[PDB]
Design an enzyme around this catalytic site. Structure first.
Site, PDB file in Angstrom:
ATOM      1  N   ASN A  52      47.994  40.116  37.286  1.00 38.01           N
ATOM      2  CA  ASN A  52      48.868  39.625  38.347  1.00 38.01           C
ATOM      3  C   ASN A  52      48.702  38.124  38.565  1.00 38.01           C
ATOM      4  O   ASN A  52      47.625  37.547  38.337  1.00 38.01           O
ATOM      5  CB  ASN A  52      48.616  40.356  39.663  1.00 38.01           C
ATOM      6  CG  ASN A  52      49.710  40.086  40.691  1.00 38.01           C
ATOM      7  OD1 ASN A  52      50.512  39.152  40.549  1.00 38.01           O
ATOM      8  ND2 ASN A  52      49.743  40.895  41.741  1.00 38.01           N
ATOM      9  N   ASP A 119      42.348  41.588  34.498  1.00 40.19           N
ATOM     10  CA  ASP A 119      43.015  42.082  35.706  1.00 40.19           C
ATOM     11  C   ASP A 119      43.734  43.389  35.404  1.00 40.19           C
ATOM     12  O   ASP A 119      43.242  44.197  34.609  1.00 40.19           O
ATOM     13  CB  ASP A 119      43.975  41.049  36.287  1.00 40.19           C
ATOM     14  CG  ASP A 119      44.197  41.235  37.747  1.00 40.19           C
ATOM     15  OD1 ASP A 119      43.186  41.219  38.505  1.00 40.19           O
ATOM     16  OD2 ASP A 119      45.347  41.427  38.155  1.00 40.19           O
ATOM     17  N   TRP A 120      44.890  43.600  36.035  1.00 39.32           N
ATOM     18  CA  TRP A 120      45.809  44.667  35.630  1.00 39.32           C
ATOM     19  C   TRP A 120      46.157  44.603  34.144  1.00 39.32           C
ATOM     20  O   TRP A 120      46.528  45.625  33.539  1.00 39.32           O
ATOM     21  CB  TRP A 120      47.088  44.588  36.443  1.00 39.32           C
ATOM     22  CG  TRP A 120      47.033  45.240  37.778  1.00 39.32           C
ATOM     23  CD1 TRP A 120      47.388  44.682  38.969  1.00 39.32           C
ATOM     24  CD2 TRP A 120      46.656  46.587  38.064  1.00 39.32           C
ATOM     25  NE1 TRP A 120      47.233  45.594  39.987  1.00 39.32           N
ATOM     26  CE2 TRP A 120      46.789  46.773  39.456  1.00 39.32           C
ATOM     27  CE3 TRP A 120      46.221  47.656  37.283  1.00 39.32           C
ATOM     28  CZ2 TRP A 120      46.495  47.981  40.079  1.00 39.32           C
ATOM     29  CZ3 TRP A 120      45.930  48.854  37.903  1.00 39.32           C
ATOM     30  CH2 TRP A 120      46.064  49.008  39.288  1.00 39.32           C
ATOM     31  N   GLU A 143      37.081  41.219  34.510  1.00 37.30           N
ATOM     32  CA  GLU A 143      37.739  41.322  35.823  1.00 37.30           C
ATOM     33  C   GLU A 143      38.730  42.486  35.847  1.00 37.30           C
ATOM     34  O   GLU A 143      39.722  42.486  36.581  1.00 37.30           O
ATOM     35  CB  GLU A 143      38.417  40.008  36.209  1.00 37.30           C
ATOM     36  CG  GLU A 143      37.394  38.886  36.508  1.00 37.30           C
ATOM     37  CD  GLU A 143      36.664  39.061  37.866  1.00 37.30           C
ATOM     38  OE1 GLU A 143      37.288  39.519  38.849  1.00 37.30           O
ATOM     39  OE2 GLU A 143      35.454  38.741  37.960  1.00 37.30           O
ATOM     40  N   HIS A 284      37.418  34.485  39.420  1.00 35.92           N
ATOM     41  CA  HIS A 284      38.230  35.581  38.889  1.00 35.92           C
ATOM     42  C   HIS A 284      39.040  35.155  37.665  1.00 35.92           C
ATOM     43  O   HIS A 284      38.911  35.741  36.587  1.00 35.92           O
ATOM     44  CB  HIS A 284      39.172  36.122  39.964  1.00 35.92           C
ATOM     45  CG  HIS A 284      40.194  37.068  39.431  1.00 35.92           C
ATOM     46  ND1 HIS A 284      39.859  38.181  38.692  1.00 35.92           N
ATOM     47  CD2 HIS A 284      41.545  37.063  39.511  1.00 35.92           C
ATOM     48  CE1 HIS A 284      40.958  38.830  38.354  1.00 35.92           C
ATOM     49  NE2 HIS A 284      41.995  38.176  38.847  1.00 35.92           N
TER      50      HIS A 284
END
Ligand SMILES: O=C(Cc1ccc(O)cc1)Nc1ncc(-c2ccc(O)cc2)nc1Cc1ccccc1
Ligand SMILES: O=C(Cc1ccc(O)cc1)Nc1ncc(-c2ccc(O)cc2)nc1Cc1ccccc1
Lengths: 308, 229, 230, 316
Positions: A52, A119-120, A143, A284
């Site tokens: 994202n 991430d996603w 992450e 992140h």
């Protein structure tokens, strides 16, 4: 926040223009995937999956290090980056999965790919690998959406804000206020982005409206056992258990230091066999703060998997 | 009247600092000027080594001189009368984390301008905590109670860092303001109010500017005539 | 500026009922007095009733003797007031600069006219030569208690400063977690609560102290250079 | 400061008038000593020596315990109490000592005296001890001028105050504002004294002026090896040395707890052999917060010392 420039950065700053120019598009279902391609060493493909708020740009200074050993393909996920919007305007996890696998078939991949996820992004590359087990040469994550969320403990204090966007506030939090791009994105990078590097991440979502909905709707799929979208919980449940069994498949995890989610997820990582662990500068969006170490760590890992 | 000490009202305080949060040597700095019964001083804090720095910036912002403070002459001014030679503090900071930092600085005088020289060494900052996590917006205002103790006034103050989630993260600050000229009328007991706020706001930066106001006062309640204490 | 709708008629006393434990000495004191709502003035008749007399300076149980008695301005919301009806409390931690510590556990309530309290003082590790056991302490000077929201409760944090007999001062660090057990409307932003707690006038008298705590909520009067943060 | 009455003390309160009516008097050199006398069991003498700002009243509730084993005799030092004024109008250690040793002869003491000292009155019992090694059976002390004072360390925060007093503002501090009776003395007692008890202590120095001088020149006798009067530092040094060797001599140290000076002197007291140590809860005027406890401690100590008609007294 505050933040100072890494000054050693501008000597090598790849602006948005000089990223997108180097991408090729291809039609995919009712739309298309703008994407990067090293092209050359194509007997292997290593696919890079941003998450994202970001885009294929997030891997720019990472990707050269490992270009000389395999083809690397970095998409923008649908609705993000210069990739084109989704047909129905829905952007949930499987949507992204629809447009992405569809796009896979268009690439003439090896039938043994290496996915690198963030991430996603990692979620896509995990739930693909679960359903395409015969075709994963190796996995690399960071992450990541490793497993489901029951215990908020080692986790950044981001509850209630989650409730605040799985709320109907989130529309006017994100569509109206571009919260993840403008507030959250630089917030979770150690250095300050040179004002044009930010200009990159911002431009895809430079305007109010449902054009921001990907950044609103990615986190509304947070796999919380209580209160999370059941299907997403079931997906991550399912690829975890397989991931947890994936003894035969070489892995590599990269926690960031401090991190953001890395702290809380890292226990779950070594619940996956065959993981080489490493550690790098940052928060992140670790690619902003340690790309070159990230770089050569992924290079030397792929070199290993390609030795049998 | 403020001739005496060899010091003009407005004055340029060049504010070199030396730092070490945790693992990380960083050699910042700060160029500025301000006023002395205004209480107001601005500094272009540049970071000049160890960019990028790996921790929320504001922990070193109190490190960046109570020469700058509205001392109404009904409460004596320790720091003004430590000049021309200047003075020194030692600051002990304890974050509710448990993490800590000590602030050692000398506020000399060297060509008609406030050559301060701050030193700053922190550690035991926790990873998931708002300093490594760089969640600090900035400092709320604060009230530093001051009292006399022999050839010294110690300052004690509760600072609150406002966080992105609206919540706060506070710490506790004890400062040893030891003069170096021997100074007459030491002060009674009183608070110095601060609003320190960052103001080069939204830039392409390379540096942060903060502006601190600083006023000494007493109260707005006042005693039943009965007193005690 | 409402009142009768809250269980509260402005006119309202207090009755404290402390029980204690400093170092080793199990005492049991008691308070009786009053103040008022919106100007937030107060004063009460504290009186030992077990473990008299005190091996330690009395002045350390005095922050234990309510923030209902607080003067709140329009521009800032009043958690303690909005609280009742029925269930609201605190949990409070002292560290005396000499190294001694203290823990305090209330339970306020409303009966007739107003408040009852059950306090529970408990300190430890104060030093022999320290201002508390040496009973040097004339009293506390005023100071401003910072007050800030954290979810379901308010955190307060001041540095309270004991005036010693020698003119010097003894500071401690207090920090308070006020949690009202009925959920309550608005929760304030961040601000200050300033007290000056003094003891009335007891000469040589009978054996009671009486103190006059009054505290009014405010906002840093040096107002903000608008282009800034936070 | 604050302080609350002891609830059950006022029942047994002894006012000043009730004390003084139990006192004796005798002339001593050019003046006289008011004093208090058990009288019976005069085969022994236990002398109790109060110190600055106090008087024999200090001991009123302590003494009833010791009385039934040995005669007790409790002076008011010169220029203090209801005793007479001093001839030269001066009141330093030795002034107090001349008048006090005179009064020791007019009393028909046994050879070996038992001493109970507090504050400066223990320095008086220590001095006489050094020049009288054969007249001493035991010394009980407390809050006492043990040894010289080298640094202000484990000591109460009363430097400055001391030098401030060895200075023409001690005049204004003591003579006019009765510093040590009206502030320092209820300051150093846990309970709150009843008004009439304080009225005892205040009765001497109630009037402003030269009737307050002993409370001023007593702390001006304080032995700081830097800045203190040299003859006093030489006295205590001499009896400290004799006291450190005094194996012969049985002693008892009542530590006050917190105490005032107790903390800074417990270790000096430990440098005296044949000392049994005890502990009662108080500040400096320990007597005023635990005389029944001190009471029985001193008792079992004298009873045990008084079997000097056989073996030693501290097995082993
Ligand atoms: O929803 C996700 C994806 C995710 C990844 C790993 C995981 O273990 C669980 C979920 N992430 C997310 N979920 C929540 C938040 C978040 C919530 C509130 C807040 O104040 C800051 C960040 N951030 C993020 C990621 C992010 C996006 C953009 C910029 C920075 C970070
Ligand atoms: O000088 C003495 C006698 C003494 C005893 C033991 C010792 O180790 C050293 C000296 N005492 C003294 N010397 C100084 C002070 C003193 C001075 C200032 C102050 O604020 C508190 C106490 N107090 C005291 C005790 C006292 C005397 C009279 C009334 C109350 C208390």
């Amino acid at each position: 926040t505050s933040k100072v420039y890494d000054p050693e950065q501008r000597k090598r700053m790849i602006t948005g223009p000089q990223w997108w120019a180097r991408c090729k598009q291809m039609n995919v279902l009712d739309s298309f995937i703008n994407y990067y391609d090293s092209e050359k060493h194509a007997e292997n493909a290593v696919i890079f999956l941003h998450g994202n708020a970001t885009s294929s740009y997030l891997w720019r200074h990472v990707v050269p290090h490992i270009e000389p050993v395999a083809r690397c393909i970095i998409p923008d996920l649908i609705g993000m980056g210069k990739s084109g919007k989704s047909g129905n305007g829905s952007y949930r996890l499987l949507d992204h999965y629809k447009y992405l696998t569809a796009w896979f078939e268009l690439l003439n991949l090896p039938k043994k790919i290496i996915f690198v996820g963030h991430d996603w992004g990692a979620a896509l590359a995990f739930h693909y690998a679960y359903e395409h087990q015969d075709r994963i040469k190796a996995i690399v994550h960071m992450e990541s959406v490793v497993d489901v969320i029951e215990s908020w403990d080692e986790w950044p204090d981001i509850e209630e804000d989650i409730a605040l966007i799985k709320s109907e506030e989130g529309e006017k939090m994100v569509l109206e206020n571009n919260f993840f791009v403008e507030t959250v994105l630089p917030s979770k990078i150690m250095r300050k982005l040179e004002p044009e590097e930010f200009a990159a991440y911002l431009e895809p979502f430079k305007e109010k409206g449902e054009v921001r909905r990907p950044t609103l709707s990615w986190p509304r799929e947070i796999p919380l056992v209580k209160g999370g979208k059941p299907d997403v919980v079931q997906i991550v449940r399912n690829y975890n258990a397989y991931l947890r069994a994936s003894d035969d498949l070489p892995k590599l995890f990269i926690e960031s230091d401090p991190g953001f989610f890395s702290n809380a997820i890292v226990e779950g990582a070594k619940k996956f066999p065959n993981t080489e662990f490493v550690k790098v500068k940052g928060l992140h969006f670790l690619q902003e703060d340690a790309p070159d170490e990230m770089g050569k760590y992924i290079k030397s890992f792929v070199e290993r998997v390609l030795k049998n | 009247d403020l001739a005496k000490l060899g010091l003009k009202e407005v004055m340029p305080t060049k504010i070199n600092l030396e730092g070490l949060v945790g693992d990380h040597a960083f050699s910042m700095e700060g160029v500025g000027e301000g006023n002395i019964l205004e209480g107001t001083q601005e500094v272009k804090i540049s970071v000049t080594k160890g960019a990028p720095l790996p921790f929320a910036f504001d922990i070193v912002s109190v490190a960046f001189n109570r020469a700058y403070t509205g001392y109404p002459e009904e409460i004596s001014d320790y720091f003004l009368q430590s000049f021309p030679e200047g003075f020194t503090y030692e600051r002990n900071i304890r974050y509710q984390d448990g993490g800590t930092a000590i602030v050692k600085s000398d506020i000399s005088l060297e060509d008609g301008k406030f050559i301060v020289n701050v030193d700053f060494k922190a550690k035991d900052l926790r990873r998931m905590g708002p300093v490594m996590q760089q969640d600090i917006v900035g400092m709320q205002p604060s009230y530093e109670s001051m009292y006399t103790n022999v050839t010294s006034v110690i300052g004690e103050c509760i600072i609150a860092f406002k966080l992105q989630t609206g919540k706060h993260f506070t710490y506790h600050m004890r400062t040893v303001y030891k003069s170096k000229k021997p100074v007459e009328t030491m002060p009674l007991y009183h608070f110095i109010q601060h609003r320190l706020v960052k103001t080069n706001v939204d830039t392409a930066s390379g540096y942060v500017v903060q502006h601190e106001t600083a006023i000494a006062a007493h109260s707005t309640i006042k005693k039943i005539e009965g007193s005690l204490p």
